[PDB]
Paper text:
The enzyme DmdD catalyzes the last step of the MeSH pathway, the hydration and hydrolysis of MTA-CoA. DmdD belongs to the crotonase superfamily of enzymes, homologous to the equivalent enzyme in the fatty acid β-oxidation pathway. The structure of the DmdD monomer contains two domains. Consistent with the gel-filtration data, DmdD is a hexamer in the crystal, which is also similar to the architecture of canonical crotonases.
The crystal structure of wild-type R. pomeroyi DmdD free enzyme has been determined at 1.5 Å resolution by the molecular replacement method. The hexamer is generated from the two monomers in the asymmetric unit by the crystallographic 3-fold symmetry axis, and can be regarded as two layers of DmdD trimers. The N-terminal domain (NTD) adopts the typical spiral crotonase fold (β-β-αsuperhelix, β1–β11 and α1–α8), which is organized around two roughly perpendicular β-sheets. The C-terminal domain (CTD) consists of three α helices (α9–α11) followed by a long loop at the extreme C-terminus of the protein. The CTD mediates the hexamerization of DmdD, and the long loop at the C-terminus also participates in the formation of the CoA binding site of a neighboring monomer of the hexamer (see below). The active site is located at the trimer interface, and the three active sites in each trimer are identical to each other due to the crystallographic symmetry. There is one striking structural difference, however, between DmdD and ECH. The C-terminal loop (CTL) in ECH is positioned nearly 90° away from that in DmdD. Wild-type DmdD has strong activity toward MTA-CoA, both for MeSH release (equivalent to hydration of MTA-CoA) and for CoA ester hydrolysis. The hydration reaction is analogous to the canonical crotonase enzymes, and likely employs a similar mechanism, with Glu121 as the general base and Glu141 as the general acid.
Numbering used by the authors:
A (entry chain A), B (entry chain A), C (entry chain A): 4 to 248
D (entry chain B), E (entry chain B), F (entry chain B): 2 to 251
């Protein structure tokens, strides 16, 4: 019951458990409105229990994701509390992606900007192609990132590089972007095909091992290394003694 | 009342709110004595409320800053508690810079060493030129960094690279230094002019947006990502619904 | 009484206080069994009080360390709690290395894989040669890292690169590995000789300064920067006012 | 509004006109022991309560005992591996995190046994009201069992780490005023804990939604941070909550 | 020494010969409500007290009530936006952080209302002395207001997160021995809280400056860290404090 | 089994047949003041107790007083520099960390003075049993000394940061039921604290080794984390402990 029914996500579940999840509004470069965020909360809250083994996340069209749907935003005439609540929903979706235990590999193309970079950062692995570029351009437009960029992008490229990106609108692309920490993989070919290659290999690993890799490590990074040491020992104890292992 | 009156800092407030703050003792490569640290505490404690929009921090002369004023130090014949108190003042100055909400862009030249690298690290952005080099040389002289290097330089280049720098006295310069994380910008020309270009653009952004960028992100990095998610939503709520925004 | 007596470690204490510590089972690429881990706990729990000034850690033979002794592991038929306890011993050894206050420089050759990369990560400095390669290959074999990789390797190369390494089994070597953060030094010659050069220089520094560098910095990185600021001031107060300093 | 009470099997739900929803465990025959299906219903209810418009929740257990803890019959029969049980524990934690950090005030009306996983459920509420029949314990420890539903976090936050360690290490039982004074419940009544909980809930429901949302989510987050970073976050929560038009209106 | 008492308008200051400085809120006509100008004077006083040589502070409010909290008249009139109010809250936090982490022992002599922002101010002191007229509350919540001056941090540290949530969610008032036992004040007197605070302050002022500095700054920092990292920092604080020549002299 | 009791000079050790080991400080002539050699023996004993098979420890001091704290005679004579003393403090911390996080339940049987470093030692135990002669204080502060053996961490966890600050800032002494209620000891007896500690230890020793190990190590680690990360770790501790064959057997 994985492909249940979603309006704003196109799903393709392959026989080995890899589910392609595609943002489906290329006419607006897949900008994320509140309904799409809720479908991401739902999908990533249930993916593990529904048996999904890995996810390849992509955006329909030439551009991965332009970020916050500004048309919806401007029209909603939001108060500070209304917008704070919208941001909590973005965070719920991305927390379910990051800490959910289902490996997520993003196949990037074109503009990975603003909230779109926040969505890409919620994946475990990112594959960029020759057309891909990254930025947090809204900062210069007076907009602060409220979907996790200050957390995940800093974890990806360093707090001072993330501050630079939002303070100046600086753009990164090509090898320079991969080397900075924006994506672990860069291809001269299809980022979708490379993501699928990675996803198929990951899906052939043990479910429990991938679950721990895709949830425990982020938690350990939130604590003192002297307390994470103890938690890591328990994670290794459970994962490495499973019959299948 | 920004250029009020300081003995150890030369100030130049431009019409757009950018304030150039220049260490003014080139004869001693701008080494930082206790009086200069107190003026940095005062300036950065009040800059935001005095209306400063951005700061370009520089050192008069060929060298940004040589660090701790050792002549004052040796002559003061400090006990462990006396020196601990001096370090707390350094930290107060740099905390007001980092968490104060006023964007600070350092225009580096020559030696950015020891406490001088600690001062540069307290800025949000760093611009280095072709003469700039970085080191924590005192470590080999038996001196531990007590002005935040263990915190900020580790945040800039990684804990293990910071440990290497103080343990061995290793020097970095050129593109290698920029790539390591010591400065986000490297220019073949004037680091002052490049810093001013960046500062003028930043000063044209909304005051509240820059305030959040230059205070909230450092705070979020000090907490678990699962708690920063909630705080970030409130920061976005306030910043993105301001009338000006 | 440094070279006391160990079965699984070969020790060579030099006249300047540098102790070479060599894993001594090249026939199994120095895989770490429980007895070797206990000797590492013992050696690194007492090295500082026994007067060791620096340690050069190496593996006998062409390969630094292959990781967990799988023959012992499979034969022990471990329950989840048995294995959790083994992981706590690995962590105790590596915590004594990291926070013990005695500088440790690892001279790497060949395969630095799995638990072997966890051991190398517990050193302060790493020197790699032209034959050195790094990986966490067990992940694809269903094995989770329970000896600190999720903590230290993430601190070395970034959480998302560490997740990539264990999720995919990706290998790094050469300049690419040094640049990623796996080793601060890469040599075209002998990694042992380069490690000794570094170690001899470090051993000529003050004992207290090296102790603080090799214990305080890791602790500061486990707290909010606003609380580490205060602790760092006390560390600087004690280190910088010692008579020898 | 939206339907709040339909579609559940393991929770009895009663939505009052002022937005207070009574959530009642409904298996007194097994002292409301929590099986995996009940935990999943708690996840669903507490993941959606705020957005559905629920203003406050009074949590109770049908019968003489609030909740005896994890359903051991189900546990025993399942012959769970360490990973299977770790997964069950993560679901308990998801339900309790949605209760604690969800922003909807929860007031537990306690009676009889509030033990093991039942004390973990009670600890996920913001307020607890106990009566003269109420008693508290973490007895599983004496049975070789560790608390995997938050007791080590929330009960420590309620009574102190060393008193929580004592309870699980020794099976020590607390009741009456001593239990209230220890930090196990903020309110103790000589009468009906349900009626006192409803009094508290009706007053809470009369306050502003955003103010209750912040009180019932932000404070727990602030306690997980250094006080020097929570200071900054609290200033932003105060800025949003205290300038809402409805607050000025008051 | 340096001048400590001059130049202020919203604080009455009295420096005694042994270094104890009485700091008194001086607007009893409005129950010492704290406006932005008073907060700024607290920032200035507590940012410089240690370096000026102040050995201890006895903090009090003129009149029958210590402090009723934020100045609502000023608040209402200012018609503040969320960002304007967030900025006001950061100033309150700066004043209270300089009190808590500044290294100068602060003993609050309480009387009457210690409510809302007034309880936040009292919580920024190291020690609190209450009298028989003293009462505590965070009533703003019932008025749709959230505490933005540290109550969620310090009052939780004083009485427990769940009792702090209770106070702001319900407006519950505490007084007398019950308040002292809850953790709202370490000392309760049947007489003058000011006189008891001065007794405590005079004894504290007789101890070594560095020892009091560490006690009144390091402990709060240690509580923001994992205990396994605070262990290391505490060893360095002990090393510096316990080997100062003056300590040996004792 | 392995030898547990031989080879020590500064600890009297008595291993009972059920695995409870009585560890007794043995210098009543100096009220069991802790010198560096005794701290090193505590490091050795508590670093190996779990692996040697010790099931629980009852910690006591010979004579009328549990422990008066750091050995000042040794301290004074050593004329320690700040770094020398910081190093001594790290050894105290290593001994107490091995006690707190080692996984072997420790029950302290207190009598008489539990002061300064002696309260730090007592605080490293999981449970404390006090008698009618027992009193607690951190008097060193009045003597210009700061606690460098964990009091700022563990005593704060026991009684609250503000009560710990009060104790060291003022030298305040606690005893009797007031001390127990404050959080200084979970058990108070009108009889023998040693006999009550042995009763508790014998019951604890009858429980499963792994369950006691987790209770006596995991909970302290969880309290050093955000509750949202401890939730995940606790689920893994529950998974391992609750599926061990011996637990099912129960």
């Amino acid at each position: 019951d994985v492909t249940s029914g979603y309006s704003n996500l196109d799903l393709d579940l392959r026989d080995n458990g890899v589910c392609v999840v595609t943002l489906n509004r290329p006419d607006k470069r897949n900008a994320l409105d509140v309904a799409t965020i809720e479908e991401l909360v739902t999908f990533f809250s249930t993916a593990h229990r529904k048996g999904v083994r890995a996810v390849v996340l992509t955006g329909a069209g030439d551009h991965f994701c332009a970020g916050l749907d500004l048309v919806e935003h401007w029209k909603a005439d939001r108060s500070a509390d209304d917008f704070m609540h919208v941001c909590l929903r973005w965070h719920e979706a991305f927390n379910k992606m990051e800490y959910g235990g289902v490996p997520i590999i993003a196949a990037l193309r074109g503009a990975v900007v603003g909230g779109g970079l926040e969505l890409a950062s919620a994946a475990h692995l990112r594959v960029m192609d020759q057309s891909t570029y990254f930025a947090l351009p809204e900062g210069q437009r007076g907009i602060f990132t409220g979907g996790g960029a200050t957390i995940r992008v800093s974890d990806m490229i360093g707090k001072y590089r993330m501050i630079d990106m939002i303070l100046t609108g600086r753009v990164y692309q090509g090898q320079e972007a991969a080397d900075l920490g924006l994506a672990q993989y860069i291809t001269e070919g299809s980022s979708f095909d490379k993501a699928m290659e990675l996803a198929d290999k990951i899906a052939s690993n043990l479910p429990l091992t991938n679950f721990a890799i895709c949830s425990a490590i982020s938690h350990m990074q939130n604590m003192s290394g002297l307390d994470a040491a103890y938690a890591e020992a328990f994670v290794g104890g459970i994962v490495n003694t499973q019959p299948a292992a």
